[PDB]
Amino acid sequence: AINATGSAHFGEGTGPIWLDEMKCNGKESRIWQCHSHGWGQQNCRHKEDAGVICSEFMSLRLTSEASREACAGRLEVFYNGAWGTVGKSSMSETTVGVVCRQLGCADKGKINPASLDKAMSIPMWVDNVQCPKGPDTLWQCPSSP
Amino acid sequence: REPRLVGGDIPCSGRVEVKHGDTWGSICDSDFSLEAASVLCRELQCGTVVSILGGAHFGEGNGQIWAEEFQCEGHESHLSLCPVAPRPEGTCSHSRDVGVVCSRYTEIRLVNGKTPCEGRVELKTLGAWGSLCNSHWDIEDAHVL
Amino acid sequence: WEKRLASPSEETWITCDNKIRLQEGPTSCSGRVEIWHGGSWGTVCDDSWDLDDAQVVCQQLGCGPALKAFKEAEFGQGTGPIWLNEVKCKGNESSLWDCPARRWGHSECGHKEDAAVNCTD
Numbered sequence: 048a049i050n051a052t053g054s055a056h057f058g059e060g061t062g063p064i065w066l067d068e069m070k071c072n073g074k075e076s077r078i079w080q081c082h083s084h085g086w087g088q089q090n091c092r093h094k095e096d097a098g099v100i101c102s103e104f105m106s107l108r109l110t111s112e113a114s115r116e117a118c119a120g121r122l123e124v125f126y127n128g129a130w131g132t133v134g135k136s137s138m139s140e141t142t143v144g145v146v147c148r149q150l151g152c153a154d155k156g157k158i159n160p161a162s163l164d165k166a167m168s169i170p171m172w173v174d175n176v177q178c179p180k181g182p183d184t185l186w187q188c189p190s191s192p
Numbered sequence: 193r194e195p196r197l198v199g200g201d202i203p204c205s206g207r208v209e210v211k212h213g214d215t216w217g218s219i220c221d222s223d224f225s226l227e228a229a230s231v232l233c234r235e236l237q238c239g240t241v242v243s244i245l246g247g248a249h250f251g252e253g254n255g256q257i258w259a260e261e262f263q264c265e266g267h268e269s270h271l272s273l274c275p276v277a278p279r280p281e282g283t284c285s286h287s288r289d290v291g292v293v294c295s296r297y298t299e300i301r302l303v304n305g306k307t308p309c310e311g312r313v314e315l316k317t318l319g320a321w322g323s324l325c326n327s328h329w330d331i332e333d334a335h336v337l
Numbered sequence: 338w339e340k341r342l343a344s345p346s347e348e349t350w351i352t353c354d355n356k357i358r359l360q361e362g363p364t365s366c367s368g369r370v371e372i373w374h375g376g377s378w379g380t381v382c383d384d385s386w387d388l389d390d391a392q393v394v395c396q397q398l399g400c401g402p403a404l405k406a407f408k409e410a411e412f413g414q415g416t417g418p419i420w421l422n423e424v425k426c427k428g429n430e431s432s433l434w435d436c437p438a439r440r441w442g443h444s445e446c447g448h449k450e451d452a453a454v455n456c457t458d
């Protein structure tokens with residue numbers, strides 16, 4: 048876990064508030080093994096709902112000088128709470144199409160040469176990405192570690 | 193969910209007690225809000241809420257304390273129709289009982305008339321009964337009485 | 338009603354209590370923030386509560402400068418209706434009535450989120 052968000056960071060929830068005042072040492076296996084007041088015993092409201100951001104969480108974006116998110120730019124992968132770039136080797140038309148469909152831009156795309164300016168020169172995360180037919184997200188495409 | 197005002201000298205004020213089917217019990221200052229007091233005065237036909245007094249203003253109850261928290265929106269006609277959020281026990285003691293003062297504090301009756309509709313107008317103020325004055329006694333007031 | 342010349346001894350001079358007070362604190366300059374409005378004593382919700390808000394309260398009460406601004410009802414739970422929510426004091430206003438916030442309205446806040454301050458004695 049990287050973050051532990053509260054106060055409805057990910058939105059208000061609907062339903063009973065089952066647990067409250069959870070106390071865990073971090074070495075437990077299941078959440079119900081933690082010390083809590085009881086099943087449904089709480090004094091809380093729905094605007095204070097717990098959430099987490101885990102280590103194996105990934106997001107994708109295209110960064111240009113003009114805008115952080117756009118339909119053209121540098122391809123960046125957010126892994127382990129950090130951003131990073133993707134290697135150009137073994138790129139294919141199926142792989143470029145998956146990125147464009149995943150972000151919501153279009154059905155196909157093309158790889159242009161490097162632009163005049165690079166921002167922060169973030170380190171490279173992954174390489175040799177190979178996308179099969181059928182996935183609509185980059186997370187299901189085999190790659191190098 | 194039947195409300196009741198007990199312990200007050202004037203007609204429409206006292207300690208707030210609510211019957212859960214067949215048992216009367218007190219309410220906490222924290223659990224009771226302005227919206228619930230609006231319904232309580234309206235349900236009991238005591239007008240509008242003037243004050244909410246805590247810390248056992250009209251005495252301390254002797255019995256069970258309800259832990260649930262009313263979530264009235266203010267427009268309900270009875271406390272029964274109000275959504276209620278349950279809470280655990282141990283929240284308060286009996287020195288934190290809530291009290292309410294609603295607006296219709298006037299005490300008037302008709303005496304020395306054989307028919308209950310007709311009689312002499314009397315008013316109670318400062319702990320004593322007395323007779324009104326003829327000046328400014330029109331038929332508009334008599335219609336309301 | 339009758340109009341007459343009166344000695345200054347017969348005239349009524351009255352001093353009223355303060356609108357804002359702090360409760361449930363060992364130090365007279367520390368405790369839960371309560372305000373009076375519309376016939377009832379009420380509290381403040383901890384949303385958007387910071388040290389700028391605490392400075393105004395500690396100045397209005399006449400205490401010293403503020404140094405901590407607690408939240409989630411450290412000093413105890415309050416009573417009555419919650420009157421203020423999302424207070425945005427700039428730190429220099431003379432009263433909590435000057436700062437913009439949700440005024441005398443329905444607050445989703447509960448009574449476990451009451452705001453508290455601690456001023457220098």
Ligand SMILES: *[C@@H]1O[C@H](CO)[C@@H](O)[C@H](O)[C@H]1NC(C)=O
Binds near residue numbers: 049050052
């Ligand atoms: C998560 O924690 C990191 C590291 O402290 C911080 O930079 C980031 O803003 C946090 N994100 C959220 C959504 O709380």
Ligand SMILES: [Ca+2]
Binds near residue numbers: 069070071
């Ligand atoms: Ca914990």
Ligand SMILES: [Ca+2]
Binds near residue numbers: 068
């Ligand atoms: Ca709790």
Ligand SMILES: [Ca+2]
Binds near residue numbers: 328329330333
């Ligand atoms: Ca009249």
Ligand SMILES: [Ca+2]
Binds near residue numbers: 384
């Ligand atoms: Ca809060």
Ligand SMILES: [Ca+2]
Binds near residue numbers: 387389424
């Ligand atoms: Ca603020």
